[PDB]
Amino acid sequence: APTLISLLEVIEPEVLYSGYDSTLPDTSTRLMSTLNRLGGRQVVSAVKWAKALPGFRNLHLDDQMTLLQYSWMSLMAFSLGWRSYKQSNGNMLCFAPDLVINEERMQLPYMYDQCQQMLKISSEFVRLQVSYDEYLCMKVLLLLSTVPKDGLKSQAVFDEIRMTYIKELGKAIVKREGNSSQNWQRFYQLTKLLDSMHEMVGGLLQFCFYTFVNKSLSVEFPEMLAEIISNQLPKFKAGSVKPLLFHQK
């Protein structure tokens, strides 16, 4: 019988190609439209990934839906952070192996600030030398990190699932460092990274809501992303979402 981490390793979706045609030149509108079209496909993958997470399907189906809609951006920015860390030690954004944004390429006026925001996520991975297994456990924890103020319909299964993956994060820490009695610092550092993901993602969510609503920028969104965003917009605006934080700030 093999380990839950090994399962996590197996069910991790392979990186998608964007199919971006660099023979036509880069514009702000084109890049963002491409990223969304890619993000739609990545979210599809994410739904299939979540369904294979032991515990997830015990949750009520509205809860499954809610968690996915609430956390999709941090899920995607985290993986982006990880790919960029492995691909170029955080110097570039690796959206896809055929869609790599280097410093020179981020110099587009409307792209610059969003790239700086995505770049800080990967810089955290660099600063901490996150290991693959640590990253995988943190990522499920992200899926379980944003909830409605009024709570979930199967709160207790949810609490049990969070506990399962917190321990699993513990095992990732052990595999990486051995039985150091300073493994407690690492756990601390990793939960603090998770907490800081709300802030880091908030900027990306603002851009996303803005470009989705102010359609004078002509940014295209696929149906998969449109469904989630238009559903999440009024909830986040009504200040009705609760970020779970490990440490009181």
Partner: peptide, 11 residues
Amino acid sequence: NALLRYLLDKD
């Protein structure tokens, strides 16, 4: 949320 509901039941 037709599409998300579909992907969660599929398979």
